[PDB]
Design an enzyme around this catalytic site. Sequence first.
Site, PDB file in Angstrom:
ATOM      1  N   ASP A   1     -14.198   4.039   0.322  1.00 34.69           N
ATOM      2  CA  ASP A   1     -14.482   3.502   1.695  1.00 34.69           C
ATOM      3  C   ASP A   1     -15.806   4.012   2.065  1.00 34.69           C
ATOM      4  OD1 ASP A   1     -14.306   2.729   4.449  1.00 34.69           O
ATOM      5  OD2 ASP A   1     -12.892   4.146   4.914  1.00 34.69           O
TER       6      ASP A   1
ATOM      7  N   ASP B   1     -19.804  -1.695   5.025  1.00 36.55           N
ATOM      8  CA  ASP B   1     -18.527  -1.063   4.945  1.00 36.55           C
ATOM      9  C   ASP B   1     -17.510  -1.695   3.840  1.00 36.55           C
ATOM     10  OD1 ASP B   1     -16.257   0.594   5.368  1.00 36.55           O
ATOM     11  OD2 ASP B   1     -15.929  -0.027   7.367  1.00 36.55           O
TER      12      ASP B   1
HETATM   13  C1  LIG Z   1     -12.799   0.525   8.915  1.00 33.86           C
HETATM   14  N1  LIG Z   1     -12.371   1.487   8.537  1.00 33.86           N
HETATM   15  C2  LIG Z   1     -11.022   1.749   8.641  1.00 33.86           C
HETATM   16  O1  LIG Z   1     -10.436   1.560  10.009  1.00 33.86           O
HETATM   17  C3  LIG Z   1     -10.605   2.832   7.957  1.00 33.86           C
HETATM   18  C4  LIG Z   1     -10.432   4.134   8.187  1.00 33.86           C
HETATM   19  C5  LIG Z   1     -10.489   5.223   7.225  1.00 33.86           C
HETATM   20  C6  LIG Z   1     -10.525   6.856   7.770  1.00 33.86           C
HETATM   21  N2  LIG Z   1     -10.039   6.816   8.967  1.00 33.86           N
HETATM   22  C7  LIG Z   1      -9.672   5.975   9.943  1.00 33.86           C
HETATM   23  C8  LIG Z   1      -9.998   4.639   9.546  1.00 33.86           C
HETATM   24  C9  LIG Z   1      -9.307   2.430   6.970  1.00 33.86           C
HETATM   25  C10 LIG Z   1      -8.162   3.062   6.841  1.00 33.86           C
HETATM   26  C11 LIG Z   1      -6.767   2.372   6.018  1.00 33.86           C
HETATM   27  C12 LIG Z   1      -7.086   1.043   5.574  1.00 33.86           C
HETATM   28  C13 LIG Z   1      -8.056   0.690   5.538  1.00 33.86           C
HETATM   29  C14 LIG Z   1      -8.400  -0.714   4.873  1.00 33.86           C
HETATM   30  C15 LIG Z   1      -7.441  -1.866   5.265  1.00 33.86           C
HETATM   31  C16 LIG Z   1      -7.557  -3.025   4.261  1.00 33.86           C
HETATM   32  C17 LIG Z   1      -8.579  -3.252   3.675  1.00 33.86           C
HETATM   33  N3  LIG Z   1      -9.401  -2.276   3.520  1.00 33.86           N
HETATM   34  C18 LIG Z   1      -9.507  -0.881   4.131  1.00 33.86           C
HETATM   35  C19 LIG Z   1      -9.432   1.180   6.454  1.00 33.86           C
HETATM   36  N4  LIG Z   1     -11.774   3.063   6.810  1.00 33.86           N
HETATM   37  C20 LIG Z   1     -12.497   2.147   7.339  1.00 33.86           C
HETATM   38  N5  LIG Z   1     -14.041   1.767   6.749  1.00 33.86           N
END
Ligand SMILES: CN1C(=O)[C@@](c2ccncc2)(c2cccc(-c3cccnc3)c2)N=C1N
Length: 370
Positions: free
Chosen positions: A35, A225
């Site tokens: 991520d 992202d």
């Molecule tokens: C946008 N985003 C999120 O909402 C998430 C995140 C990370 C940490 N704390 C809060 C939010 C996240 C969290 C869970 C799943 C995803 C996700 C879902 C579908 C596809 N691919 C990533 C993203 N990471 C990103 N970049």
Amino acid sequence: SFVEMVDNLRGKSGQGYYVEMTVGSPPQTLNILVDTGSSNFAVGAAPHPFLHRYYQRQLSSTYRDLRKGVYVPYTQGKWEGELGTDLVSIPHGPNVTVRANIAAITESDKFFINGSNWEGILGLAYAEIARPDDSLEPFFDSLVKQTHVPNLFSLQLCGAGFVLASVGGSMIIGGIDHSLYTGSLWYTPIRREWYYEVIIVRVEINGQDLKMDCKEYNYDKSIVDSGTTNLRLPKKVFEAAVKSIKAASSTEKFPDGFWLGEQLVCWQAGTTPWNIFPVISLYLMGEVTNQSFRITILPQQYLRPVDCYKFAISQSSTGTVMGAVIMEGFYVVFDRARKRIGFAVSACHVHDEFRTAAVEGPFVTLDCGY
Ligand SMILES: CN1C(=O)[C@@](c2ccncc2)(c2cccc(-c3cccnc3)c2)N=C1N
């Protein structure tokens, strides 16, 4: 050697790319979402209906408690946990072991995804946005500080290409693997070290300029992202983009549930009329002020398979997000050392015999930032 790192990512379409990691001693194997859109190493550490395995601190001889909690509510949902440190390795990454911060997730809502096959998230962005604050050193910073690994990583996300489709890719840590791309690597500056923030200076649909003040493209920011599936665009830009895409594909009509990214459309086995949808070009600011370069993506990237597809461009209220479907066309170099992000045509990107994804520059553009 980068060869060991090739194909170290896997995932399910629309559900993120993950890499295998181990945490603790003895090593506990977990699949972790890669991520670039966040900055915590956060891992399931308690039973959850979508988790079939999780991090068990009590089984780790090398676990250390920081005696500190962390609570992260966000738009889509929330996660909640307990801070500590432990030894961490990436079996198909660099051959090192690092002591890193770990948020052990004890409760969460709409965080984990049913059947995604990952149990945690590796936030590769900067400390400025780490929870609960910037004093919690992110994983990559610890890795660089503790090892001799160069301050850079690169991502080749490949998608599916021809049960959610399985996807594959590579995360190369500490360098650039020249077999993963063709042609030139073009760099755009990292505007600020929090998210991987960049600047888009213009956009075209089938060679046609949207003709907006460039501030609109970056309102209120633009980021790269890997943790977002879609290309997300600010309201004004989204509307203009869809209008143009609709006109380009006017022959043949779809329900606006499709254009709204929640309704699939289907053809059957190799009949998909790609040639009816236009290409999309995003021009990113070059390292030289009045220069830019364009990355051009195909319908094969912005129509995500589900032969059924969903429109993978959607509206944002928090600025432009260049997510997985944009990255899938390309080899993306996160050159933290030189505060820049490179793009080159990927060795794996999906395309037909009349079109191809492309990275091309420079274009001279004679104030675009928020
Ligand atoms: C946008 N985003 C999120 O909402 C998430 C995140 C990370 C940490 N704390 C809060 C939010 C996240 C969290 C869970 C799943 C995803 C996700 C879902 C579908 C596809 N691919 C990533 C993203 N990471 C990103 N970049």
